[PDB]
Amino acid sequence: VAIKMVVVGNGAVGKSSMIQRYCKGIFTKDYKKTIGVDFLERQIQVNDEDVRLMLWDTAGQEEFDAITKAYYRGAQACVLVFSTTDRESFEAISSWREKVVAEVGDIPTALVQNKIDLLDDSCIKNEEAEGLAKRLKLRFYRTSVKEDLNVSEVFKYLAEKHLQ
Numbered sequence: 280v281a282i283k284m285v286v287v288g289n290g291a292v293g294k295s296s297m298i299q300r301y302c303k304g305i306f307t308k309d310y311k312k313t314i315g316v317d318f319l320e321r322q323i324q325v326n327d328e329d330v331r332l333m334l335w336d337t338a339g340q341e342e343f344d345a346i347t348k349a350y351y352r353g354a355q356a357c358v359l360v361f362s363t364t365d366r367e368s369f370e371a372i373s374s375w376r377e378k379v380v381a382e383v384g385d386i387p388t389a390l391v392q393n394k395i396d397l398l399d400d401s402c403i404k405n406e407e408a409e410g411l412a413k414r415l416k417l418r419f420y421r422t423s424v425k426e427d428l429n430v431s432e433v434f435k436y437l438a439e440k441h442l443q
């Protein structure tokens with residue numbers, strides 16, 4: 280029993296970091312990276328079952344080539360990510376949603392405001408974020424990959440939603 284999920288959003292919102300935190304338990308400050316993967320994975324327990332979650336980073340690519348389309352193909356859940364400190368990343372969300380729906384249909388999706396550890400100097404107000412989440416009909420999480428807040432919860436919610 281495997282579940283494929285795509286992580287979707289503008290550059291530098293924390294997508295690859297989110298995947299690395301969830302699958303490996305690590306957060307790297309320096310970002311000095313070397314090797315390419317198409318997905319990471321990890322086992323999760325849901326409704327007394329051993330689910331294999333495979334997380335693909337769609338890397339902010341707006342026009343989908345054959346590789347990008349393969350990233351989206353067979354996606355069973357979607358994480359839409361914006362950054363606390365990047366207003367354009369928040370504004371791009373409704374467009375990203377349309378691209379995801381056009382590509383794969385109406386799969387379980389969550390909206391994530393990442394970098395919430397930096398909330399004291401946020402580019403976006405909670406009321407705006409909740410307002411967008413309501414408009415798009417999406418459960419909203421405020422997340423810190425850096426501090427491991429509301430990362431596991433997002434993927435668990437989506438996995439449960441798919442297996443309901």
Ligand SMILES: Nc1nc2c(ncn2[C@@H]2O[C@H](COP(=O)(O)OP(=O)(O)O)[C@@H](O)[C@H]2O)c(=O)[nH]1
Pocket residue numbers: 289290291292293294295296297307308310393394395396397422423424425426
């Ligand atoms: N303060 C803070 N920084 C973060 C968080 N998540 C990611 N970052 C940083 O934001 C930068 C971009 O992250 P990255 O995962 O590469 O973004 P991506 O382009 O969406 O894959 C990196 O320097 C990360 O360390 C977070 O929760 N809090």
Ligand SMILES: [Mg+2]
Pocket residue numbers: 294295336338339
């Ligand atoms: Mg990336």
